[PDB]
Amino acid sequence: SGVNNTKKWKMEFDTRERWENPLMGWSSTADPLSNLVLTFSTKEDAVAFAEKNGWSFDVEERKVPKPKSKSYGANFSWNKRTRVSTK
Amino acid sequence: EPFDNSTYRNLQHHEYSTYTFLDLNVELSKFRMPQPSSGRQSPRH
Amino acid sequence: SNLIEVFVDGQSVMVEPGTTVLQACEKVGMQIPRFCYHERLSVAGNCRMCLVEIEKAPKVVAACAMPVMKGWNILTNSEKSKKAREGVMEFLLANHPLDCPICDQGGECDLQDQSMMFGSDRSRFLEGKRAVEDKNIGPLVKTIMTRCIQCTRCIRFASEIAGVDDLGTTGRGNDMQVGTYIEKMFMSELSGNIIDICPVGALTSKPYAFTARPWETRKTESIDVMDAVGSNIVVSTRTGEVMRILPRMHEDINEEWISDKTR
Amino acid sequence: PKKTSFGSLKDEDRIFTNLYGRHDWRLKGAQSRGDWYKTKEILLKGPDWILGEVKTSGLRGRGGAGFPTGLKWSFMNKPSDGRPKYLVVNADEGEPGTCKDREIIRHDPHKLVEGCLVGGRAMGARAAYIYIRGEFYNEASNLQVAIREAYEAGLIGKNACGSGYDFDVFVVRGAGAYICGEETALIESIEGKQGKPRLKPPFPADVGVFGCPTTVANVETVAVSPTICRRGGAWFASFGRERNSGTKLFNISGHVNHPCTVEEEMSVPLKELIEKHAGGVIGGWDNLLAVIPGGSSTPLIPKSVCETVLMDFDALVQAQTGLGTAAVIVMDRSTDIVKAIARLIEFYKHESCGQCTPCREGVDWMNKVMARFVKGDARPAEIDSLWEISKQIEGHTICALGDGAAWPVQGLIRHFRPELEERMQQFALQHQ
Amino acid sequence: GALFVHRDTPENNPDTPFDFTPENYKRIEAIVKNYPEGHKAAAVLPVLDLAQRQNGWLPISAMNKVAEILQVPPMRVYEVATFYTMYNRKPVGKYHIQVCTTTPCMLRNSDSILEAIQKKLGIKVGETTPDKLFTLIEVECLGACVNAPMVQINDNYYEDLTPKDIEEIIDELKAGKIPKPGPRSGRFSCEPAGGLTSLTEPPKGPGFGVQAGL
Ligand SMILES: Cc1cc2nc3c(=O)[nH]c(=O)nc-3n(C[C@H](O)[C@H](O)[C@H](O)COP(=O)(O)O)c2cc1C
Ligand code: SF4
Ligand code: SF4
Ligand code: SF4
Ligand code: FES
């Protein structure tokens, strides 16, 4: 339920081939850039990093919470069905 | 009629049948006003 | 317009009337610790972890079900508020079984995380813990009911969100056994989502059981293909394969729940 | 003017002159006492008159709430919102020491139902939903015959007392619990639900049952209303001290020679109660080690505190306790105080509904550590911990049962601290 | 008995033939009538008592049969039955003993009454007689704590009970004769053992203290 992770921006890459090591079943991988994620406060600084390094680009807007109008008296209504069946 | 000091007049609480509460509840229906309607007959409905 | 003015720990913020104490808190970025309230699942008010003292108050208010009115300063970091948090958290943890190394919620458990932030650092218990007999409501979800904290978040989810009335909390007192009493079988198409709502390891996915841990599992974002709804989901990958599929936050498409087939 | 030599209630001052069932408890003796008279006139006078009279009456919360009922009964007195208004009589009486409502239901429930209708005029309700305790099976039927004669006579139901009022009264027998004693959990028992306290707001006043407004009152508060509006609230206000206005059906119990529920003059030193009306306590004043003042929730007090205190709300509050339901349980040197509250706190653990974490967990934790305290299996600092967790569950619970559990143990800690140390000390050497 | 999970027993199974007699449907229809339409789940509480007053206990069939006749899910029926005390889900032995044990009762030595029931009847607390006569269970205050130690036989509750006093109560109840419920000593309902104090002068007449029109 904690949300102190949906506040920053990242610099993730696309995952490449990951093949098991012949001896002991590793995840031997030849993607040097795989295990790097950066942190960006906003996205316009994040995009600026893309331009200076000239990487391929696509973004995703923040999924802000639509404001759920909560209530407690609705759980005990007279006509509305919002009356809860268990408490 | 005279005021008493050592007489218990609640002998009926001993002589109450197993269904006595329900035996008085069943015919209580005649003194009933139209019960309020919630716009339906159950919240799931 | 009608947006009532109110202070939070100082700074004032206007808010729609009828908004509870929580819903005003995140407007400035305050996530008060909660256990029994979900933003899209009713209002319970039973966990009492949301308890935050308000200014001038002689009693700490239950922030979940308390509508705020004019000029009510939310004393978030106030001493008695943190005092209420400390007492209530150790009460929840009192009868909890010592299962963290064997509980799959280890590393992503709300009871685990909050005790680090809002919690003590030692125990005052000197008695025997409560033990609840396990249940069985499917091969898709495990039931370890001794780890339950009776947040009732599961029973509400079934009642409204899943639309099926088969879950509840039988008993009295400390014998607050949450389940189906009689032997029953929690088959709904949204059944798998009660794993995510539960803050503890009370219900966990049998297929994923004892396969990975939250810190090692890399996360990737993709879509659901099992249905034409096309639900946004996050894929867990570790050591080069997939273990568990979690629903993403998308109010238009899936909210935060997915079908059993997708999970 | 101020009757400081305060005591010695009279039979006319006794609101219910048939508490023992001595004379005709049925409807035939009800109108003899003064009941079912002039109710036609007052019901026509409008709700404000009873509100005005109860303001002079000084009725406070007698179910342990300790709040002026005149304010509460007028709290929801608003114009009709379409949703019917209702009335509830909190006849649970689950407290270990509450018996007066059991007596009033068994013997004088005609005053109760009339109080509902004269009260129901104030809130403008269409029916009452009194909650008779399930254990009171024959008392439930006792008020049913009171229900029977009052309904067909026009006193209650359509044209309530012939005053163009459709107020009714329904009966709901319980199935056993203390948590139904509190109104916020009572309503769920009425509302086809397991007894669990409801978070306020929303209050019962604006929405009580089935999404409809409902007023909750103690059994005597509603039952005394017809008399205080018939003879006069000021006369009833002449009893009790300031903010203690009225008289109370004391519940004398414990190690007392003649345990009793007398409707006895209120705001009175407990010395006058135990000797004059209860025929003394066993062994005398020196025998009694401590007294449960007014209820199990109310912290018990010793002779060192109860040597002069009057049983009134204000004096009880400053005595670090409450009068509550006037459940006075006297307890002597021979019995152990820890064992005394052991059974009480064990009962409290047997009655928590488990809804909120502090009551569900804290009370059980209290039971285990206290059970050791009976033998004495602890260290000096455990009393301080038992102090600590008592404050932790004090007020943090959804309902008032949690802090209702805090008060008895809290009073036990503060008063007989050396007793706990020595019994605990005795535990060490005997089990060396 | 301290088992909030239902085991499917051959005797207590959903196939157990539970039903109602011609009078009972009149009883339950009176229960549902007492409540406003639209919200009739309030009738769940009294209808369970109707099964209590017919079967003497609540089989899982009784709870399941209540569910559809009340148009409520079965689990809600279980919740109502499981929480409350004498909504006993396990069969009980006819004479159902509730010795009152809470602090006011034990302070005046309810243990002696409990011990007398313990030894004379021969079975432990919560158990039943070999051929279904008695079931002794410690109970808390029922709401009459003014009197001496207490025991609730079925629906007939008893007070003013000394350790000896319950002994001839249990003597005559063994033979099938039901003793008069209520206090057994000179106390009738709530008056002193040493002579009543209040209720001496006759009550006032009909209507007193008229406030003009009133
Ligand atoms: C644990 C608990 C038990 C209670 N039991 C009773 C009771 O048996 N009878 C009662 O009238 N009020 C009882 N109350 C008080 C009610 O919650 C409520 O405040 C009261 O009925 C108000 O009465 P009034 O409107 O006459 O002041 C109890 C409260 C608590 C917290
Ligand atoms: S629920 Fe959380 S705290 Fe409890 S055992 Fe599982 S991981 Fe540990
Ligand atoms: S089982 Fe899980 S979801 Fe259900 S009440 Fe317990 S902690 Fe909450
Ligand atoms: S204090 Fe909390 S757990 Fe106890 S009865 Fe009240 S609501 Fe239930
Ligand atoms: S959020 Fe208020 S109690 Fe869980």
Ligand code: FES
């Ligand atoms: S004390 Fe025996 S009835 Fe409550």
Ligand SMILES: [K+]
């Ligand atoms: K979970």
